[PDB]
Amino acid sequence: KYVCVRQYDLTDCGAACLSSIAQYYGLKMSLAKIREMTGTDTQGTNAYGLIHAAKQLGFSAKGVKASKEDLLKDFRLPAIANVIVDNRLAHFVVIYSIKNRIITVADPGKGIVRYSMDDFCSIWTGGLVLLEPGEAFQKGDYTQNMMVKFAGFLKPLKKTVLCIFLASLLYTALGIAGSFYIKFLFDDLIKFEKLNDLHIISAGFAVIFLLQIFLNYYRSILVTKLGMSIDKSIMMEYYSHVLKLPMNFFNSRKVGEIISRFMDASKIRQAISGATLTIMIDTIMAVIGGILLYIQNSSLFFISFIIILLYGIIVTVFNKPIQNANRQIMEDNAKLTSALVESVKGIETIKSFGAEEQTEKSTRDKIETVMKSSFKEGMLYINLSSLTGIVAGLGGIVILWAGAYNVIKGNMSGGQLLAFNALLAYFLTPVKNLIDLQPLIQTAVVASNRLGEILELATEKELREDSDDFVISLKGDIEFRNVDFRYGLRKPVLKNINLTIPKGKTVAIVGESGSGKTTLAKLLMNFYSPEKGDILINGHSIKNISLELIRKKIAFVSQDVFIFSGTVKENLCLGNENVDMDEIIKAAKMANAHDFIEKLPLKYDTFLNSEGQKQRLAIARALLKKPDILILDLEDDVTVIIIA
Amino acid sequence: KYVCVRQYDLTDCGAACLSSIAQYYGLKMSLAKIREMTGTDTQGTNAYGLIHAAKQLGFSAKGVKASKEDLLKDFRLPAIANVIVDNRLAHFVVIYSIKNRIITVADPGKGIVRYSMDDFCSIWTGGLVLLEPGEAFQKGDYTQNMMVKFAGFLKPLKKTVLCIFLASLLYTALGIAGSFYIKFLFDDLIKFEKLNDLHIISAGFAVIFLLQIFLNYYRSILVTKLGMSIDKSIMMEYYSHVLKLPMNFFNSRKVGEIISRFMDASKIRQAISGATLTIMIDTIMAVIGGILLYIQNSSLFFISFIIILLYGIIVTVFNKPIQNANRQIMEDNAKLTSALVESVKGIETIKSFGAEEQTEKSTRDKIETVMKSSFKEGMLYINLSSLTGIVAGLGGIVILWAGAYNVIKGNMSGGQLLAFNALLAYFLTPVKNLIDLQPLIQTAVVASNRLGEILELATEKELREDSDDFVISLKGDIEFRNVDFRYGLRKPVLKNINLTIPKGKTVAIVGESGSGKTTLAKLLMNFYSPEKGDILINGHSIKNISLELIRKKIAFVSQDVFIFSGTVKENLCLGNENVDMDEIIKAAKMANAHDFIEKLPLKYDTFLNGQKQRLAIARALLKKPDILILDVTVIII
């Protein structure tokens, strides 16, 4: 079926290709699991990670080189090709069918595309990964329907939904009733010259409109409140789960990558509320409108049905090219913004080298590309609007023509045609909304999957299957035995360490221009678990001790100091909740910080927020922790591991 | 009259307040021209900068009182007060009148707002600046209309505008002609059972509609092309000017303070195209439609005029609170995004200290604040929509009622009433579009002013004395004569520097200063000029030497390396793309970079998302420099 899995982020390209191949063989899995399983870092994945992850799925993976001649031969059909686009990135494609003249490749960023053989070999660098379902392969479906999971938020908000439904029904009924004002005017009042009845009936048809307006007001208020509640629920759940995820999740992804899902929550809410309400209301309203239209005249109703069918056909045809054009515009805008940012940041180098003429030329070229993509999307929109306007206006003229023909023949009256034209709104608009619901549903399904893949992950506490046991004291001799570490699937950083740290006697490890020693301290904070070996405090293993106690009794003063926008009092008391003024005073006095307090605008520095007043706050906080183990990047302090 | 000049960016509160005071006494000036004299930088300005700028502007002002709640005393009516509300990076408000425990201030970020004597005292820190015009104060209007400046981009495009105007006129005429189909249908064809003429007339009106659709297609294509052309022209002009500005413009600004100007250019394009075309077309179309409606029936035309007047009144009333709600929502969203960024970046610290619950609670509080602001704006929109819908629907019902009354009385016919209902679109909608043009014009006037403030700034070459076109050798002794410097209305980083670098010698400078030796390099590169000193090479002042030669012959290797996208061959050729590969490889082997180069696909990777230092040094040697500064005379920091 030539499965092509989209890539949610700019990095999970090899993971998307592996997921596509797995789904091609009857194994569907969440993209998050494969992403954390291929060793996807900020830079991206590689052939080794994909091969290892395929081995974890029972696939038989190999890493081979190939050329045009090797393509001319016969090998496994759905392989992975390391195609380089934009001359960088870890971009991958899935080669499905050889078809010597034209190579058909599934790209996670564009879809199923077809390249010329020469063009393909120009863009393909020879890196081929051959996947084949091995003996251990097992078909299955290991993903959850996230649309149902997010629609479960509507269960507590049932009374609001019911009230919205009832208000919509009343609004529709009042509008349908009031659409007959023109018929009553032209068939009874004007024809027979009734003046008192004209005033009485017209006044009664204005109260209906006022009730309709009030119902719309109430329903709009309810819908706004429902949407805000759903947005808050989704955002808070996502953030609460994210805050508990392991450090691998944070090290493997950027900040915007984690943050854009807050915006995707808005799309999920848009689906769950708008699509559901629109379907529920508009189905009934369109059915009633169509019944009434057929009541007035069968031929005019059939013409209206043809009009709405043509509109739906045109919209469905134009749906996907618009999405492709919008994606291309977004990519071009991102490229232009990135170029502008790098140009502004390095303005000094441009000035020194006199490269202002070529910089503006490159910016002009990128702006020209952006304008070309914008014109393509604008022309698509113009064509769609022209076609739909032709259909709508010509159908209206044809409806008036056929209604006049029927009135002349005597099958209708002067007011029945105008009543039909009035009810045309309540028939055509619901079906138009039902047809237009497609892009919203598709985009929000994508966003719901994007949030649910993360929401399926396991937090730090869940991974620690072993309990706390009975370790409450963290005072002892630290022992690293046969400890090996790996940052995902990269080269090992720490190999066969046998290290002993006494109880109190301050030590300081000495490295060789390497940051790996720093992550040694990260192995004491349980941020990562060693691949092999053990870490023990006295005679008790680190994995044996509770996570909360380990992070509470160990203080790490990282060289990357984190200061958030808050008062100095709040910045110092982070996660304590049990402190007195004297303790903070003593801690600041110890770490040369109480002196700087008096030198400021002097609102006890509780306003907000050189690299000497940021770190010193970190050591002050570390002493506030009262840690059993202190690490810097009383005798019973279990040494002070200083990173030197 | 209280002038409440608004706030273009985050760090120009004091500049905006000083501009407001200057405009109060009758001195209008560019905000960017004022933002420069105040010493504004990335962290904002202080009271001393405001006092200095006011002294330069002609005032006789004293400030920094560090006083207390002495507002009872009769001081000068307009003043500047430091405000620490809503945190932010510094904030000043302009006090205009102090009346009976009510304090009237204008806030550049919000507007003219009154709080109290008590609430203002809780935010006022006692730092007041007393602003008084002096003997040398002169009135003027030294700014200029930037909307006229950006309208000149329409001068090269006049065949397109005329074609758009003609197509719009033809489209409007065809639509007005086709609005009478229902009148011909009901008054003549249906009544007299003219079966044969009905088909012909309906076919003719279908042809008219098809011609209208074709004209709309052509006009839309032309409008899109015109808008793209204007937008690209404005963007390129702004970027070309920005690339020539001195370094004082880039140190005092942020990276994200220019992309905002690019979107400002987009908004200026939106105005210059849409507002002009809408006025030109819709004025004529509305006049014609109103004349036709009056021809059909005078009373119904008066009713339609009342409807449009009520709609205009309602939207004009609701225009401003919507803007305030949007501004508040933007501020709350910015706060929430900043909190999320800070929490995600410092996740290790949060995990170490067990502050996940407090972080979650704070994020929930900020989300609730954002939701409250969103609900306020949504309720404003709902009220406006309800009022507008009431007006529109009741106007339609009243028009039908009065038309039926007139038909019964014999003043018109049913077909005439239906034709009036058809022409109501071509009358009302142009006026609705003309009325709805106010927010667009306001937003784009703000954007045009914001971009033109930068466009008015003088370039690096403008602030230079005539270059002595005889010194082509920057090889002589480098002499610093009483060089003094400061990074803009701040503490002086260098005081009384008197050194002399010997010709052809590798010298080293150490002063225990993090930004002293780098600053020496900056002045040697003519990025900044010494305030009370001189720099000489070969007995020639640095000001008399051409800037092009100065940048061409002096190479600087900085701690941060600008490696943007273009491979390794084009990146090392950032200045000049010329010269053949033998020189490039010679200089690459010269410094540090030939071994870890061939391990890549022939130096080619056009994204460039230890080695950086090697690339920077190699690029420096490709320049064939006369004075090399590392962070032939060699200077080592």
Side-chain angles (χ1 to χ4, degrees), chain A residues 87-88 199 209 217 232 239 245 342-343 348-349 351-353 358 360 363 368 383 386 401 522 525 551 562 565 575 607 625, chain B residues 87-88 186 199 217 232 239-240 245 342-343 348-349 351-352 358-360 363 368 383 389 401 522 551 562 574-575 605-606 608:
Chain A
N87 299 113
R88 198 181 278 273
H199 298 318
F209 177 74
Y217 180 78
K232 197 176 137 190
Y239 194 66
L245 283 178
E342 322 313 329
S343 161
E348 223 182 308
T349 313
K351 285 269 188 62
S352 178
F353 284 91
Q358 91 181 14
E360 75 176 0
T363 302
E368 283 175 350
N383 290 346
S386 288
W401 183 358
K522 306 288 186 61
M525 302 270 273
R551 316 276 254 275
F562 158 73
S565 302
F607 158 70
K625 266 191 87 169
Chain B
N87 304 117
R88 282 174 285 184
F186 266 76
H199 304 316
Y217 184 75
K232 192 180 117 176
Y239 193 68
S240 301
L245 286 179
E342 285 175 32
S343 168
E348 296 219 4
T349 311
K351 287 183 176 295
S352 169
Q358 330 182 347
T359 305
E360 182 181 357
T363 306
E368 290 172 342
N383 292 342
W401 186 351
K522 303 326 208 233
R551 261 75 171 278
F562 167 68
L574 173 54
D605 38 349
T606 76
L608 260 67

Coordinates of all heavy atoms in Angstrom, one line a residue, chain A residues 87-88 199 209 217 232 239 245 342-343 348-349 351-353 358 360 363 368 383 386 401 522 525 551 562 565 575 607 625, chain B residues 87-88 186 199 217 232 239-240 245 342-343 348-349 351-352 358-360 363 368 383 389 401 522 551 562 574-575 605-606 608:
Chain A
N87 N 21.7 19.8 1.2 CA 23.1 19.5 1.4 C 23.5 19.2 2.8 O 24.6 19.1 3.1 CB 23.9 20.7 0.9 CG 23.7 20.9 -0.6 OD1 23.2 21.9 -1.0 ND2 24.2 20.0 -1.4
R88 N 22.5 19.1 3.7 CA 22.7 18.7 5.1 C 21.6 17.9 5.6 O 20.8 17.4 4.8 CB 23.1 20.0 5.9 CG 23.8 19.7 7.3 CD 24.1 21.0 8.1 NE 25.3 21.6 7.6 CZ 26.5 21.4 8.0 NH1 26.7 20.4 8.9 NH2 27.5 22.1 7.5
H199 N -48.9 44.9 9.8 CA -48.2 45.4 10.9 C -48.1 44.4 12.0 O -47.1 44.3 12.7 CB -48.9 46.7 11.5 CG -48.9 47.8 10.5 ND1 -47.8 48.1 9.7 CD2 -49.9 48.7 10.1 CE1 -48.1 49.2 9.0 NE2 -49.4 49.5 9.2
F209 N -36.7 37.0 15.5 CA -35.3 37.3 15.2 C -34.6 37.7 16.5 O -33.4 37.4 16.7 CB -35.2 38.5 14.2 CG -33.8 38.9 13.9 CD1 -32.9 38.1 13.2 CD2 -33.3 40.1 14.4 CE1 -31.6 38.5 13.0 CE2 -32.0 40.5 14.2 CZ -31.1 39.6 13.5
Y217 N -26.3 34.5 21.2 CA -25.5 35.0 22.3 C -25.2 34.0 23.4 O -24.0 33.8 23.7 CB -26.2 36.3 22.9 CG -25.5 37.0 24.0 CD1 -24.4 37.9 23.7 CD2 -25.8 36.9 25.3 CE1 -23.8 38.6 24.6 CE2 -25.2 37.6 26.3 CZ -24.2 38.4 26.0 OH -23.5 39.1 27.0
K232 N -7.5 24.3 28.5 CA -6.7 24.3 29.7 C -6.5 22.9 30.2 O -5.4 22.5 30.6 CB -7.5 25.0 30.8 CG -6.6 25.4 32.0 CD -7.4 26.3 33.0 CE -7.1 25.8 34.4 NZ -8.0 26.4 35.4
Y239 N 1.6 19.3 30.0 CA 2.7 19.8 30.8 C 3.0 19.0 32.0 O 4.2 18.8 32.4 CB 2.4 21.3 31.2 CG 3.6 22.0 31.6 CD1 4.7 22.3 30.8 CD2 3.7 22.5 33.0 CE1 5.8 23.0 31.2 CE2 4.8 23.2 33.4 CZ 5.8 23.4 32.6 OH 6.9 24.1 33.0
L245 N 8.9 13.5 32.8 CA 9.6 12.6 31.8 C 11.1 12.5 32.2 O 11.7 13.4 32.7 CB 9.4 13.1 30.4 CG 8.1 12.8 29.8 CD1 7.9 13.3 28.4 CD2 7.8 11.3 29.8
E342 N 20.7 34.6 11.2 CA 22.2 34.4 11.2 C 22.9 35.6 10.6 O 24.0 35.9 11.1 CB 22.5 33.1 10.4 CG 21.6 31.9 10.5 CD 21.3 31.6 12.0 OE1 22.2 31.8 12.9 OE2 20.2 31.0 12.2
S343 N 22.3 36.3 9.7 CA 22.9 37.5 9.1 C 22.9 38.6 10.2 O 23.9 39.3 10.3 CB 22.1 38.0 7.9 OG 22.3 39.3 7.6
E348 N 28.8 41.7 12.6 CA 30.2 42.2 12.7 C 31.1 41.6 11.7 O 31.9 42.3 11.1 CB 30.7 41.8 14.1 CG 31.5 43.0 14.8 CD 32.0 42.6 16.1 OE1 31.2 42.1 17.0 OE2 33.3 42.7 16.3
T349 N 31.0 40.3 11.4 CA 31.8 39.6 10.4 C 31.5 40.1 9.0 O 32.4 40.4 8.2 CB 31.6 38.1 10.5 OG1 31.7 37.7 11.9 CG2 32.7 37.4 9.7
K351 N 30.4 43.1 8.3 CA 31.0 44.5 8.2 C 32.5 44.4 8.0 O 33.0 45.2 7.2 CB 30.6 45.3 9.5 CG 29.2 45.8 9.6 CD 29.1 47.1 8.9 CE 27.7 47.7 9.2 NZ 27.4 47.9 10.6
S352 N 33.1 43.5 8.8 CA 34.6 43.4 8.7 C 35.1 43.0 7.3 O 36.0 43.5 6.8 CB 35.1 42.5 9.8 OG 36.5 42.4 9.7
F353 N 34.4 42.0 6.8 CA 34.8 41.4 5.5 C 34.1 42.2 4.3 O 34.4 41.8 3.1 CB 34.4 39.9 5.4 CG 35.3 39.1 6.2 CD1 35.1 38.8 7.5 CD2 36.5 38.6 5.6 CE1 35.9 38.0 8.3 CE2 37.3 37.8 6.4 CZ 37.1 37.5 7.7
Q358 N 26.6 40.9 -1.0 CA 26.2 39.5 -1.2 C 25.2 39.0 -0.2 O 24.3 38.2 -0.5 CB 27.4 38.6 -1.2 CG 27.8 38.0 0.1 CD 29.0 37.1 0.0 OE1 29.7 37.1 -0.9 NE2 29.2 36.3 1.1
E360 N 22.7 40.9 1.1 CA 21.4 41.4 0.6 C 21.0 40.6 -0.7 O 19.8 40.4 -0.9 CB 21.4 42.9 0.4 CG 22.2 43.3 -0.9 CD 22.1 44.8 -1.1 OE1 21.4 45.5 -0.3 OE2 22.7 45.3 -2.1
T363 N 19.5 37.3 0.7 CA 18.2 37.6 1.3 C 17.2 37.9 0.2 O 16.0 37.5 0.4 CB 18.4 38.8 2.3 OG1 19.3 38.5 3.3 CG2 17.0 39.1 2.9
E368 N 12.5 36.2 -2.8 CA 11.9 35.8 -4.1 C 11.3 34.4 -4.1 O 10.2 34.2 -4.6 CB 12.9 35.9 -5.2 CG 13.2 37.3 -5.7 CD 14.4 37.4 -6.7 OE1 15.0 36.4 -6.9 OE2 14.6 38.5 -7.3
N383 N -8.2 30.2 -7.9 CA -8.9 29.2 -8.7 C -10.1 28.6 -8.0 O -11.2 28.4 -8.5 CB -7.9 28.2 -9.2 CG -7.0 28.7 -10.2 OD1 -7.2 29.8 -10.8 ND2 -5.9 28.0 -10.5
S386 N -12.9 31.1 -7.5 CA -13.6 31.4 -8.8 C -14.5 30.2 -9.1 O -15.7 30.4 -9.5 CB -12.6 31.6 -9.9 OG -12.0 32.9 -9.8
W401 N -34.5 30.9 -12.2 CA -35.0 30.6 -13.5 C -36.1 29.5 -13.4 O -37.2 29.6 -13.9 CB -33.9 30.2 -14.5 CG -34.3 30.0 -15.9 CD1 -35.5 30.0 -16.5 CD2 -33.4 29.7 -17.0 NE1 -35.4 29.7 -17.8 CE2 -34.1 29.5 -18.1 CE3 -32.0 29.5 -17.0 CZ2 -33.5 29.2 -19.4 CZ3 -31.4 29.2 -18.3 CH2 -32.2 29.0 -19.4
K522 N 26.3 13.3 36.9 CA 24.9 13.0 36.5 C 24.6 11.6 36.7 O 23.4 11.3 36.8 CB 24.7 13.4 35.0 CG 25.1 14.8 34.6 CD 24.1 15.8 35.1 CE 24.4 17.2 34.6 NZ 24.4 17.3 33.1
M525 N 23.0 11.5 40.3 CA 21.7 12.1 40.5 C 20.6 11.3 39.8 O 19.5 11.8 39.8 CB 21.7 13.6 39.9 CG 22.8 14.5 40.5 SD 22.1 15.4 41.9 CE 21.3 16.8 41.1
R551 N 17.6 12.7 45.1 CA 17.6 14.1 44.6 C 17.5 15.1 45.8 O 17.9 16.3 45.5 CB 16.5 14.3 43.6 CG 16.4 13.2 42.6 CD 17.4 13.4 41.5 NE 16.8 13.9 40.2 CZ 16.2 13.1 39.3 NH1 16.1 11.8 39.5 NH2 15.6 13.6 38.3
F562 N 20.7 27.9 36.5 CA 19.3 28.2 36.1 C 18.7 29.1 37.1 O 18.5 28.8 38.2 CB 18.5 26.9 36.0 CG 17.0 27.1 36.2 CD1 16.2 27.6 35.1 CD2 16.3 26.7 37.3 CE1 14.9 27.8 35.2 CE2 14.9 26.9 37.4 CZ 14.2 27.5 36.4
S565 N 12.5 33.8 36.4 CA 12.0 35.1 36.7 C 11.2 35.2 37.9 O 10.0 35.0 37.9 CB 11.2 35.6 35.5 OG 12.0 35.6 34.3
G575 N 11.6 24.4 46.0 CA 11.3 23.0 46.3 C 11.5 22.7 47.8 O 11.6 21.5 48.2
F607 N 12.6 41.8 43.2 CA 12.1 42.4 42.0 C 11.9 41.3 40.9 O 10.7 41.1 40.5 CB 13.0 43.5 41.5 CG 12.9 43.7 40.0 CD1 11.8 44.4 39.5 CD2 13.9 43.4 39.2 CE1 11.7 44.7 38.2 CE2 13.8 43.7 37.8 CZ 12.7 44.3 37.3
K625 N 19.9 23.4 50.6 CA 19.4 22.0 50.5 C 19.9 21.2 51.7 O 19.2 20.1 52.0 CB 19.9 21.4 49.2 CG 19.0 21.5 48.0 CD 19.4 20.6 46.9 CE 18.9 19.1 47.1 NZ 19.1 18.3 45.8
Chain B
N87 N 6.9 44.1 36.6 CA 8.3 43.8 36.5 C 8.9 44.5 35.3 O 9.1 45.7 35.3 CB 8.5 42.3 36.3 CG 7.9 41.5 37.5 OD1 6.9 40.7 37.3 ND2 8.4 41.7 38.7
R88 N 9.2 43.7 34.2 CA 9.8 44.2 33.0 C 11.2 44.8 33.2 O 11.6 45.0 34.3 CB 8.9 45.2 32.3 CG 7.7 44.6 31.6 CD 6.7 45.7 31.1 NE 5.9 46.3 32.2 CZ 5.0 47.2 32.0 NH1 4.7 47.6 30.8 NH2 4.3 47.6 33.1
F186 N -40.1 39.0 -11.6 CA -41.4 39.0 -10.9 C -42.3 40.1 -11.5 O -43.5 39.8 -11.5 CB -41.1 39.3 -9.4 CG -41.1 38.1 -8.6 CD1 -39.9 37.3 -8.6 CD2 -42.1 37.7 -7.8 CE1 -39.9 36.1 -7.8 CE2 -42.1 36.6 -7.0 CZ -41.0 35.8 -7.0
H199 N -36.5 32.5 -20.8 CA -35.2 31.8 -21.1 C -34.2 32.7 -21.6 O -33.0 32.6 -21.2 CB -35.5 30.7 -22.2 CG -36.6 29.7 -21.7 ND1 -36.7 29.2 -20.5 CD2 -37.7 29.2 -22.4 CE1 -37.7 28.4 -20.4 NE2 -38.3 28.4 -21.6
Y217 N -11.7 37.4 -11.4 CA -10.5 36.6 -11.5 C -9.3 37.4 -11.9 O -8.2 37.4 -11.2 CB -10.7 35.4 -12.5 CG -9.6 34.4 -12.7 CD1 -9.4 33.5 -11.7 CD2 -8.8 34.4 -13.8 CE1 -8.4 32.5 -11.9 CE2 -7.8 33.5 -14.0 CZ -7.6 32.6 -13.0 OH -6.6 31.7 -13.2
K232 N 7.8 43.1 -1.4 CA 9.2 42.8 -1.6 C 10.0 44.1 -1.7 O 11.1 44.1 -1.2 CB 9.3 42.0 -2.9 CG 10.7 41.4 -3.1 CD 10.8 40.6 -4.3 CE 11.8 41.2 -5.3 NZ 12.0 40.4 -6.5
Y239 N 16.0 46.2 4.5 CA 17.1 45.3 4.8 C 18.4 46.0 4.3 O 19.5 46.0 4.9 CB 17.0 43.9 4.2 CG 18.0 43.0 4.7 CD1 18.0 42.5 6.0 CD2 18.9 42.4 3.8 CE1 18.9 41.6 6.5 CE2 19.9 41.5 4.3 CZ 19.9 41.1 5.6 OH 20.8 40.2 6.0
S240 N 18.3 46.6 3.1 CA 19.5 47.2 2.5 C 20.0 48.4 3.3 O 21.2 48.6 3.5 CB 19.2 47.7 1.0 OG 18.8 46.6 0.2
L245 N 23.9 50.3 8.6 CA 23.8 51.1 9.8 C 25.1 50.8 10.7 O 25.6 49.7 10.6 CB 22.6 50.8 10.6 CG 21.3 51.4 10.0 CD1 20.1 51.0 10.9 CD2 21.4 52.9 9.9
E342 N 11.7 29.1 30.1 CA 12.6 29.0 31.2 C 12.5 27.7 32.0 O 13.5 27.1 32.4 CB 12.3 30.2 32.2 CG 12.8 31.5 31.8 CD 12.4 32.6 32.7 OE1 12.2 32.4 33.9 OE2 12.1 33.8 32.2
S343 N 11.3 27.2 32.1 CA 11.1 25.9 32.8 C 11.7 24.7 32.0 O 12.3 23.8 32.6 CB 9.6 25.6 33.0 OG 9.4 24.3 33.5
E348 N 16.8 20.3 34.5 CA 17.7 19.6 35.4 C 17.6 20.2 36.8 O 17.6 19.4 37.8 CB 19.1 19.7 34.8 CG 19.3 19.0 33.5 CD 20.6 18.2 33.4 OE1 21.3 18.2 34.4 OE2 20.9 17.7 32.3
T349 N 17.6 21.5 36.9 CA 17.6 22.1 38.2 C 16.2 21.8 38.9 O 16.2 21.5 40.1 CB 17.8 23.6 38.1 OG1 18.9 23.9 37.3 CG2 17.9 24.3 39.5
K351 N 14.3 19.2 38.4 CA 14.3 17.8 38.9 C 15.2 17.6 40.1 O 14.9 16.9 41.0 CB 14.8 16.9 37.7 CG 13.8 16.7 36.6 CD 14.4 15.8 35.6 CE 13.3 15.5 34.5 NZ 12.1 14.8 35.1
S352 N 16.4 18.3 40.1 CA 17.3 18.2 41.3 C 16.6 18.7 42.6 O 16.8 18.1 43.6 CB 18.6 19.0 41.0 OG 19.3 19.1 42.2
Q358 N 5.6 23.0 42.0 CA 5.5 24.5 42.0 C 5.5 25.0 40.6 O 4.8 26.0 40.2 CB 6.6 25.1 42.8 CG 7.1 24.2 44.0 CD 8.1 24.9 44.8 OE1 8.7 25.9 44.4 NE2 8.4 24.3 46.0
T359 N 6.4 24.4 39.7 CA 6.4 24.8 38.3 C 5.1 24.6 37.6 O 4.6 25.4 36.8 CB 7.6 24.1 37.6 OG1 8.8 24.3 38.3 CG2 7.7 24.6 36.2
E360 N 4.5 23.4 37.9 CA 3.2 23.1 37.3 C 2.1 24.1 37.8 O 1.3 24.5 37.0 CB 2.8 21.7 37.7 CG 1.5 21.2 37.1 CD 1.1 19.8 37.5 OE1 1.9 19.2 38.2 OE2 0.0 19.3 37.2
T363 N 2.7 27.5 36.0 CA 2.3 27.4 34.6 C 0.8 27.4 34.6 O 0.2 28.0 33.7 CB 2.9 26.2 34.0 OG1 4.3 26.2 34.1 CG2 2.5 26.2 32.5
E368 N -4.2 30.2 33.3 CA -5.5 30.8 33.7 C -5.6 32.3 33.4 O -6.6 32.8 33.0 CB -5.7 30.5 35.2 CG -6.0 29.1 35.6 CD -6.0 28.9 37.1 OE1 -5.5 29.7 37.8 OE2 -6.5 27.8 37.5
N383 N -20.3 40.6 22.1 CA -21.2 41.7 22.2 C -21.2 42.5 20.9 O -22.3 42.9 20.5 CB -20.7 42.6 23.4 CG -20.9 41.9 24.7 OD1 -21.6 41.0 24.8 ND2 -20.2 42.5 25.7
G389 N -25.4 42.1 14.4 CA -26.4 41.2 13.9 C -27.8 41.7 14.1 O -28.7 41.6 13.3
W401 N -40.7 45.3 5.6 CA -42.0 45.8 6.2 C -42.4 47.1 5.4 O -43.5 47.2 4.9 CB -41.8 46.0 7.7 CG -43.1 46.4 8.4 CD1 -44.3 46.8 7.9 CD2 -43.2 46.5 9.8 NE1 -45.2 47.1 8.9 CE2 -44.5 47.0 10.1 CE3 -42.3 46.3 10.9 CZ2 -45.0 47.2 11.4 CZ3 -42.8 46.5 12.2 CH2 -44.1 46.9 12.4
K522 N 38.0 46.7 18.7 CA 36.8 47.3 18.1 C 37.2 48.7 17.5 O 36.8 49.1 16.4 CB 35.6 47.4 19.0 CG 35.2 46.1 19.6 CD 35.3 44.9 18.7 CE 34.3 43.9 19.0 NZ 34.9 42.5 19.2
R551 N 38.6 48.2 6.6 CA 38.0 46.8 6.7 C 38.7 45.8 5.9 O 38.7 44.6 6.2 CB 36.5 46.9 6.5 CG 35.7 47.0 7.7 CD 35.7 48.4 8.3 NE 34.8 48.6 9.4 CZ 33.5 48.8 9.2 NH1 33.0 49.0 8.0 NH2 32.7 49.0 10.3
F562 N 31.2 33.5 12.7 CA 30.0 33.6 11.9 C 30.2 32.6 10.7 O 30.9 32.9 9.7 CB 29.8 35.0 11.4 CG 28.8 35.1 10.2 CD1 27.5 34.9 10.5 CD2 29.2 35.5 9.0 CE1 26.6 35.0 9.4 CE2 28.3 35.6 7.9 CZ 27.0 35.4 8.2
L574 N 33.9 34.7 2.3 CA 32.8 35.6 2.7 C 33.0 37.0 2.1 O 32.0 37.5 1.6 CB 32.7 35.6 4.2 CG 31.7 36.6 4.8 CD1 30.3 36.4 4.3 CD2 31.7 36.4 6.4
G575 N 34.2 37.5 2.2 CA 34.4 38.9 1.7 C 34.4 38.9 0.2 O 33.6 39.5 -0.4
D605 N 28.6 21.7 2.1 CA 27.3 21.5 2.8 C 26.6 22.8 3.0 O 27.1 23.6 3.8 CB 27.6 20.8 4.1 CG 28.8 21.3 4.8 OD1 29.6 22.0 4.2 OD2 29.1 20.9 6.0
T606 N 25.6 23.1 2.3 CA 25.0 24.4 2.2 C 23.9 24.6 3.3 O 22.8 25.1 3.0 CB 24.4 24.7 0.9 OG1 23.2 24.0 0.7 CG2 25.4 24.2 -0.2
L608 N 25.1 24.6 7.2 CA 25.9 25.0 8.3 C 25.1 25.3 9.6 O 25.1 26.4 10.1 CB 26.8 26.1 8.0 CG 28.3 25.8 7.7 CD1 28.4 25.0 6.4 CD2 29.1 27.0 7.6

